[PDB]
Fold Formate C-acetyltransferase.
Amino acid sequence: MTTLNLNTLSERIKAHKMALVHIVKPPVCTERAQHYTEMYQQHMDKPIPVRRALALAHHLAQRTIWIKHDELIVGNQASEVRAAPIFPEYTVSWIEKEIDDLADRPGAGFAVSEENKRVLHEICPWWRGQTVQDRCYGMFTDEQKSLLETGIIKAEGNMTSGDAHLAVNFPLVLEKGLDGLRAKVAERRSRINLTVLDDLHGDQFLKAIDIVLEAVSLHIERFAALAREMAATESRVSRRDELLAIAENCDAIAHEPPKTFWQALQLCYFIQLILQIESNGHSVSFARMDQYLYPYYRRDVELNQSLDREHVIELLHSCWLKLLEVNKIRSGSHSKASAGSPLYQNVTIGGQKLVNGEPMDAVNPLSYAILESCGRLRSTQPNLSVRYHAGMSNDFLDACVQVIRCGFGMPAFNNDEIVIPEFIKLGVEKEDAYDYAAIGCIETAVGGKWGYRCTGMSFINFARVMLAALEGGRDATSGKVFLPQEKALSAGNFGNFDEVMTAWDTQIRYYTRKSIEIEYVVDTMLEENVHDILCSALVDDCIERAKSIKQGGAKYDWVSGLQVGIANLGNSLAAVKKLVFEQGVIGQQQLAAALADDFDGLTHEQLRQRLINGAPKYGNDDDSVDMLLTRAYQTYIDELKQYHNPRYGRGPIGGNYYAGTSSISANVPFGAATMATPDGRKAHTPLAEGASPASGTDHLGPTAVIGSVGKLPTEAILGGVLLNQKLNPSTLENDSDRQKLMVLLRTFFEVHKGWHIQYNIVSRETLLDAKKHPDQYRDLVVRVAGYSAFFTALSPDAQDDIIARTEHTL
Amino acid sequence: MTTLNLNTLSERIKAHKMALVHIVKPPVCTERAQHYTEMYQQHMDKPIPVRRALALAHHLAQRTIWIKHDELIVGNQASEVRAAPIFPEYTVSWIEKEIDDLADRPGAGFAVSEENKRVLHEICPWWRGQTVQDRCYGMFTDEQKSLLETGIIKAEGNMTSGDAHLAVNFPLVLEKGLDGLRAKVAERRSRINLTVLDDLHGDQFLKAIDIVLEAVSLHIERFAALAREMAATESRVSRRDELLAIAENCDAIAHEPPKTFWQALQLCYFIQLILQIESNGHSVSFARMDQYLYPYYRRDVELNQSLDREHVIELLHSCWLKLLEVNKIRSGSHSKASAGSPLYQNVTIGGQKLVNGEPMDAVNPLSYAILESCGRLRSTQPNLSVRYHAGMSNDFLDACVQVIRCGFGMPAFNNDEIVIPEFIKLGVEKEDAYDYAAIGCIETAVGGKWGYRCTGMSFINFARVMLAALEGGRDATSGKVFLPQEKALSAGNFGNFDEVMTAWDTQIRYYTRKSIEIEYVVDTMLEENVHDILCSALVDDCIERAKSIKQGGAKYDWVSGLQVGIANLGNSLAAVKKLVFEQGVIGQQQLAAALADDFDGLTHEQLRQRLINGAPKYGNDDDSVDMLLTRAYQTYIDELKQYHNPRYGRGPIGGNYYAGTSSISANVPFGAATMATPDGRKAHTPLAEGASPASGTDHLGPTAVIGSVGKLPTEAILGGVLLNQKLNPSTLENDSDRQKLMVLLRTFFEVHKGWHIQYNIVSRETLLDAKKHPDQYRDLVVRVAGYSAFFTALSPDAQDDIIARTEHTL
């Protein structure tokens, strides 16, 4: 049975990793901001796509590049290590407001030089009115502005950043190389007829693509020249040869399709890198790297032995650390939903493949080498996701638990047993459905053939809507009544609990329509102003259609928003149903006063405990509450069926919505703006994250949790059902308990058709000593919600929310 | 019969006309440019259609208004009298080049105060890169830039101005009033679904429309207040009460549908005026005024006798002079094609109407009063067109000849006998075809239901293309060979004349495709950057479709370019066919050397003189040349059928092209860039205008001219076949001769199915004395090509082109 070595790192990688983790307050880079402003100003006469393509080519040619830390995979995102570039086309509002207050922000600090401070005040004024965000607010209705003002609906990630949230078609890049893609664009332009309106627009986008494809080849050649320059001055023979090998690799993949594993991996990273230079969208993913890079691995390692397996791990480590170098700056408020400065760069391994139309297990030696390399490095990037299926061997599943015991949150699991059948049901072609991948956190899509944001659209706070449904449509936090209704607890005029559910149904249908109206504005402002030239080029079928992903270029296009406060909604309605209506133990007006009073006073404080412990809670396998949550959630799911997403009918298959709960760390900020709820939660405290049970309310062990989670309408929540789980390391020291988990996994995915599970393995004492002496735990990694983060890079608000999570035993 | 009094004018009208005609060097106004820049800068965040609506509302609210000349119809275009406003969104290029050299431009002089030079130096640089023209050149291929640089294809009027070239739905404005229009918009916005993409864009366009309608009403009330303010300072009881009546009528039409003829005329003018404040497009036309204003004329004149018919005449005079106050400034080059600073504001009278689906003569008393009002004033505005039909009475046709004898070039004639059948053939609904009108010059459309520029698209220089077809595809003027070919006169390798025509066919198809490629860029840049909010609002069916005319909002959308050098093409090929090939009296190389040498030297002058008088010319009813010109024109007409215009399939019926010859005064500047031609024309000399015979070549009288013109494929030239005709006034003093003329008209329109005829009536001594003593002939009006102009306001080149035209006798 494969036993992985999960401790050894080369001295090169150790020093490289150590250099990155000790950058506690990374700098900010303005190079991209300058060069984009320069080209936007010089090319106002060009169409926006061409203008943006010329902006990227100017930046790539003029920006600072370097090769550092004796790296074997080259390509820097910004002028300084771990620097965040600035992207002014999306917004400058928070930049101008916060530019002097970026050092001391809890959990999101950045160092800004005075010259960068000087440059930003010269650039940002020109972008006012032209940014994506300013244009969104030039079109929002006042009602929509007010909704976004209260925070009951939020879409800040969409208005201040590029979409990304996808994987490009790496097989296409590897098969054709950069010259082959330029040839593809030329053959497509030869079929342009300039007296046909669509072709006139199409040709300008194809021109943009060619400008960017040429620039990327020139940029790879620029690094090749840099490697040769450094090789001539590098005295160490070992490093000199590597630099020359790097220069030769770059020369090859600048034009021709890769021939070796090292070349193919470097090319794939170049794409991953430049995607995050042209756009600051996060969750840029590699999709099934263990599949499309395996032919090179097999040849170089197994057949010809030009490389040793250990060399491949070193190369993977090199790539992983470059992924950790990628950084992104967010506003002070939006950073609280993104605790740990994450970029969610996902890598998918495992799963199945089709051979002559028939499915087989896809796990291969490269799958093992990738899993092992992540176990040795124990970093936040990549966000490793494993595709489970019934045919996966115990050996590989055992190797996965071995890495879970390394205590950095990975690998996480997706489930072919639900993803493949439902994707096919939706209209994903069979060959594509079997080749799906994980994107960002838990969301899934067909890599290289899918539009942006399989999840990651607008956020609805279910708890605040529920409070409004319980109180005449009034939002407790803001006081505004967006949808008036007559029934309210303070009035005591609910005659049934059925009437409470009609109130919820009618309120959530209103906020659902508003959320979609808001997304239509934001998506269209992204469509018209911030085309992704390189990203669109590498997603089927934008080249042939001659338009961007956001215009309908992708073969598939389904998206989902995020519903926040899942456990709180169910627990709250169940407490109401049981204690107020079924038992007559709590009065409607009595409850409203405790909620408005935030359970203040001894009298109200024991009423609160009756709500906490006197009514069943989500996560204990009790149907009286679990099925109620599903019933309330189902109304949102059904309402989504009345709408299409903006790309509907414009090329892509689907063009519709579904649900999702991969709400990252939005539970803490959303809860901070949520008043007391009837589930016993006090005002301003975090909500349950993702779809996990509320912390400290699941008392019947892990098996009871998956019984509850499995009862959600998982098939309609293809944005993902996020299930966290925290264990003490001692709960997996014995093979007895490791096997106990592996059977728990197979049962969750095969019996209950679960979507995903991720594991924290860490003692409560360790996380408290990480608060005490940070310099001690600089490399301590922790699973937040869909991704991993360094515990000492978290703010205390998120540190404690993780510490408060339920610790389970097997 | 009916005898009109064509000499009476009130003292009020006399003084007013004198004030306008003695403005020799009109001023420029920067208010619109200043106010549009301010709102463009302060509303960059709004969608472009809404940004333009606020610019207008800000301009109308802040701009300078006044009432002068004791006018009964109020509304000024700019701050000063006959001042031309600046419209920077279309272009600032020619403005920056010619800013100091505007006063002495021949026939296009404007006065620019140092204050205005200072204002435009602040304004223009901000618009660099954002103008329509700059963004056209951000998309043109290098080939398309070179074609335009040489001038063989031209589209200067489209890149530097709005489109206009249409009539809005005046019946809708009169029937609904302004409040009714805002209500029509509200009801349409109530059907907007903000989760449907097309409705999201649509709602922004409807918002813009409503912003503008609100501003129009506020602007009319702004004039009502001014009239009351001036009435307070007015000491003449006569004029004081007139101002009170204006204030009351402005009050009424600011919201409600008008009830009186004065109200209905004032409101129709307010629209006509504001249309030309929001857009500098010209050929803004009234369509069938004698029809949609008759209900008021009948009520006020005939049924109730609230005002005398003579008062109606004075009111029409008031409107006509306000139309003359409108002005427009063009570049130095484009002004040469628009000799006389015209605006082509057309008024259509006559024609037919359907009474329960039965054709009936539409001529009515108001038709006579409009005809008579124009005869007394003898002004360049309105461009009066009469719709001829077989059933029109001898009495009215003689009234038209009475006005033609006033010597200002009007009325011109359109022919129901060809328009209505061919419009129906195109797909125009019978009800609409019978309601067609002339737009601008000679082109025809359905007022209130048609897109822009039924004619007025790109200009192709047929003579230069023909020269290239005779010489290896080389343009003699620039030296460029855009489409190479082997056969050329220099080589003497034409085997026969059929090979000559094959060359013409091959070359003209190439230049046709390229003209449309150029139009597609320009049309698309107009669509995306300069929406006409008020114009679109008042054309069917933009409000219901929630989009502009240029986006496909109009019920009908056909357009046509302009083919220049008609008679030169036929005459040139005729000379070549007869003398070179049929009779072998001139050699191919011999002819080529004469053409390259511009017929220099006594020997070559004899060859030229043989080309002129030794071969038949267009306009003598000689089939040998007439049918050859038709066969050459047929190739362009056939090539047009392979294309659709940019609105095709986006809403409107048709969406295709047809041909046109309404080339205004472009024959002069186009001739200036055309070298010697085989028709005996010397280099740099003017070409023939429109479809008229070349001057001095039609030697067999008028009856023979219409013989030739009628042989053109008129049914395919729905942009108009333009025919000028000049007579000495002594030729129409005998009623014997006047009946000869009317017989010829009925014959030209009914038997030959001709499109149009217009008559200059003036002696050679009058035109030459006006060149010598302009101050003496400031009110001398001459017919140019489709419109009339003040002779003393024409360039010397254009003055001489008219003086050189053939003078016919009957």
Observations:
- Chain B has one domain: 9-810.
- The first strand of chain B starts at residue 28 and ends at 29.
- Residues 224 and 248 of chain B are 7 Å apart (CA to CA).
- Chain B has 33 helices and 21 strands.
